[PDB]
Design an enzyme around this catalytic site. Structure first.
Site, PDB file in Angstrom:
ATOM      1  N   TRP A  77       0.786  -1.256   0.059  1.00  0.00           N
ATOM      2  CA  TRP A  77       0.004   0.127  -0.007  1.00  0.00           C
ATOM      3  C   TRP A  77       0.831   1.156  -0.061  1.00  0.00           C
ATOM      4  O   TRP A  77       1.841   1.379   0.707  1.00  0.00           O
ATOM      5  CB  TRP A  77      -1.073  -0.065   1.111  1.00  0.00           C
ATOM      6  CG  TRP A  77      -2.101   0.832   1.244  1.00  0.00           C
ATOM      7  CD1 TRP A  77      -2.844   1.513   0.372  1.00  0.00           C
ATOM      8  CD2 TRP A  77      -2.413   1.989   2.510  1.00  0.00           C
ATOM      9  NE1 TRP A  77      -3.700   2.635   0.793  1.00  0.00           N
ATOM     10  CE2 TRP A  77      -3.384   2.558   2.308  1.00  0.00           C
ATOM     11  CE3 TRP A  77      -1.941   1.631   3.921  1.00  0.00           C
ATOM     12  CZ2 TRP A  77      -3.900   3.500   3.204  1.00  0.00           C
ATOM     13  CZ3 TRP A  77      -2.460   2.343   4.942  1.00  0.00           C
ATOM     14  CH2 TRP A  77      -3.565   3.510   4.587  1.00  0.00           C
ATOM     15  N   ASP A  93      -1.088  -6.034   8.604  1.00  0.00           N
ATOM     16  CA  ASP A  93      -1.974  -5.239   8.239  1.00  0.00           C
ATOM     17  C   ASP A  93      -3.009  -5.919   7.631  1.00  0.00           C
ATOM     18  O   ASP A  93      -3.100  -6.869   6.668  1.00  0.00           O
ATOM     19  CB  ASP A  93      -1.425  -4.363   7.127  1.00  0.00           C
ATOM     20  CG  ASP A  93      -2.422  -3.227   6.804  1.00  0.00           C
ATOM     21  OD1 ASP A  93      -3.556  -2.996   7.478  1.00  0.00           O
ATOM     22  OD2 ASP A  93      -1.840  -2.271   6.072  1.00  0.00           O
ATOM     23  N   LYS A 143     -13.967  -1.288   5.091  1.00  0.00           N
ATOM     24  CA  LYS A 143     -14.326  -2.039   3.984  1.00  0.00           C
ATOM     25  C   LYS A 143     -15.443  -3.439   4.474  1.00  0.00           C
ATOM     26  O   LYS A 143     -16.339  -3.470   3.757  1.00  0.00           O
ATOM     27  CB  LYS A 143     -13.107  -2.180   3.111  1.00  0.00           C
ATOM     28  CG  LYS A 143     -11.751  -1.572   3.434  1.00  0.00           C
ATOM     29  CD  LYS A 143     -11.094  -0.656   2.153  1.00  0.00           C
ATOM     30  CE  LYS A 143      -9.703   0.319   2.464  1.00  0.00           C
ATOM     31  NZ  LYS A 143      -8.712  -0.078   3.346  1.00  0.00           N
TER      32      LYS A 143
END
Lengths: 401, 401
Positions: free
Chosen positions: A133, A214, A250
């Site tokens: 990311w 993560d 999300k």
């Protein structure tokens, strides 16, 4: 003159540019494959019905707006560790962990990074997968750590370069930090398989590396919360005291409410109290304390067995629509006559997919077709709909035939 | 054989100690003068009706939960600047400013500190009043700056050591950063009178210092938003391009929604763009983007001329109640016949109040009286009610006769 005469204009945000170019396009066929958030089949934002339920059921209690503790809402914290570690995890039973609420998963990365900076005396190096990311780099830098990398993405297969990863990981200086996406790797959609995860763990354990996970897509990734969190759980079970970042952007669709947590798993509950007090000392001077709304919504869903169970079905819906679009894109590419292997498109997990498209091909998709995506060939599968998926596959075939 | 064995337990939170000593106290004449938020006449939290009202219009609107931009919600930012400067300000009309939404007033302070640390090439030094909010120190320290102090409180008069402040500010190396509390200094309650602000402004302007305004109590302080933000406005009018942290925790009781803003006044619109890009680049690796719910509330209030007027009235009501507790605690001390001057209690502004009490008279006040308050002699005027002001007046006379 002036205080800021020497402050330069920052560089343009590439992802935003793609998005703003899309909005300005009059082509009636245009598609937005750079959007970084779930869309339903008509391309619309989707507030889950369970979130709406939880919200109505919260307004009914006429709750106050007072400050939470620095670590945030205690019941959100405990539920959130349960979400990730599972019901009777020995970490839970022995209390050998601390979880704090943070400002979504970005805040948990930042909080975790600042905690490494101050207390992880063994290294200043955080190894990120190639690629990772994009924010990961500035978060650790600004936190005062250094970034390195390890081979992950295989450009030759659009899959997991297992041998490269394992070679790199097994050469990481002992006691460095390793960052690992728990599942649905952003931007590539490429994840190791349980079998491969096993061998990474065994290296991490053997070389004594610190594991930093993560986890922004538990449940949203495959529709199955337990599969999605399996690697974090397994590292813990091989006796690796990970730390872990969770996001509810999300998987509950709480994007702008900023709901996430940071968890360090320790030797015992005593060590956790210590890390906890020092975690609070780092949080107070960033933002004093965290926000109410999203943590209430989330706590209410996770503690109410019906809402919870209803929320999991909604998540499975989302994962399924995404998987369906992947499957359709592929079979439409066969229908169109493409002779290339496209199976990566379905092996990948989550809402991002590295298509394998080169930069010149991406320019064609945008100019000739008004398909909008980033130049690295990453598409956001959330912009694909059963209504546009045929057009897509035709455009993709065209520029690669 | 553990990563964190050498991580030490943090110091105890003095205040908490105190809050939780209170709750154990079993006497029923007990008071909690160490409570950091507004409380009403019955000692209870207070959601403002205009907040309930706004929340309601918002739930009716049925909005999504998608991400805000890095800078936050545009209409809240624009409305936020207008609150602080007053619309029709020359700053707003020429567009020479940037306002970004932040995680309340703390997040604004941290964001601006990071901005300073990275682009204020003239100095590492940040000058805080003696004393200042406790969290100012670690905010600036963790962000990478150095702290100094300048004289502010005067224990001889329980007032503003004007001539000390002036001598000190005069000896600040040119191009240092000066942090000024806008109104209602925290913890003392001591503020400069306008003519005294006039004189700090012309020193700041003469010694070319950078003026960093922390404004957490606009409206709340005196019940007049304009009088409260007078000092900030005057500095700007004198040609000092200040920066500015706003909080809505106290004036709209949004405490745990975390609604704030950081505003940099600039020489012109071009400079504001450059400063904006870099604030974005700084925010993104702290928490990506800010929470929606409280910004939605505040923009709805601030943009409806009806709710805005109503909110200002309730704000005026909070300020009057606090003023009223001060005036009566002074009234009652004279009627209990104390001989000490206590003008300072009514000269002070906002909800914290330095009493003059020594640490020994504070202990007596706990042991002999069940009045809980910190050792420094700070009281939270908000924990004072028309039911208990008579008691407290009495107790304070007993310990000081």
């Amino acid at each position: 003159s002036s205080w800021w005469t020497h402050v330069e204009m920052g560089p343009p945000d590439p992802i935003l540019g793609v998005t703003e170019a899309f909005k300005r396009d009059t082509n009636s066929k245009k598609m937005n494959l750079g959007v970084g958030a779930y869309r339903d089949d008509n391309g619309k934002p989707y507030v889950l019905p369970s979130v709406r339920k939880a919200e109505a059921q919260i307004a009914a209690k006429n709750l106050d707006k007072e400050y939470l503790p620095i670590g945030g809402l205690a019941e959100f914290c405990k539920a959130s560790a349960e979400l990730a570690l599972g019901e009777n995890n020995e970490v839970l039973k022995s209390g050998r962990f601390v979880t704090v609420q943070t400002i979504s998963g970005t805040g948990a990365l930042r909080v975790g990074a600042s905690f490494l900076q101050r207390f992880f005396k063994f290294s200043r190096d955080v190894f990120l997968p190639k690629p990772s990311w994009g924010n990961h780099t500035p978060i650790f830098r600004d936190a005062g750590m250094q970034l390195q990398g390890y081979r992950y993405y295989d450009p030759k297969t659009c899959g997991f370069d297992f041998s490269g990863a394992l070679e790199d990981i097994s050469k990481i200086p002992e006691q460095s930090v390793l960052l690992l996406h728990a599942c649905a790797h952003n931007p590539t959609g490429v994840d190791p398989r349980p079998e491969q995860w096993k061998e990474i763990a065994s290296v991490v354990k053997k070389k004594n590396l610190f594991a930093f996970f993560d986890m922004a897509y538990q449940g949203f990734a495959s529709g199955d919360g337990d599969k999605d969190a399996w690697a974090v759980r397994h590292f813990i079970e091989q006796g690796i005291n990970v730390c872990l970042c969770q996001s509810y952007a999300k998987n509950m669709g709480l994007y702008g409410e900023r709901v996430g947590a940071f968890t360090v798993v320790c030797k015992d509950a005593e060590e956790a109290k210590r890390v906890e007090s020092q975690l609070k000392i780092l949080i107070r001077p960033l933002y004093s304390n965290p926000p109410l709304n999203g943590a209430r919504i989330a706590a209410t869903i996770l503690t109410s067995p019906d809402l919870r169970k209803q929320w999991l079905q909604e998540v499975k819906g989302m994962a399924d629509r995404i998987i369906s679009m992947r499957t359709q894109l592929v079979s439409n590419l066969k229908k169109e006559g493409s002779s290339h292997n496209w199976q990566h498109i379905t092996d990948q997990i989550g809402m991002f997919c590295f298509t394998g498209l080169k930069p010149e091909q991406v320019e064609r998709l945008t100019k000739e077709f008004s398909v909008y995506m980033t130049k690295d060939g990453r598409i956001s599968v959330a912009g694909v709909t059963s209504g546009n998926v045929g057009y897509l596959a035709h455009a993709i075939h065209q520029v690669t035939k």
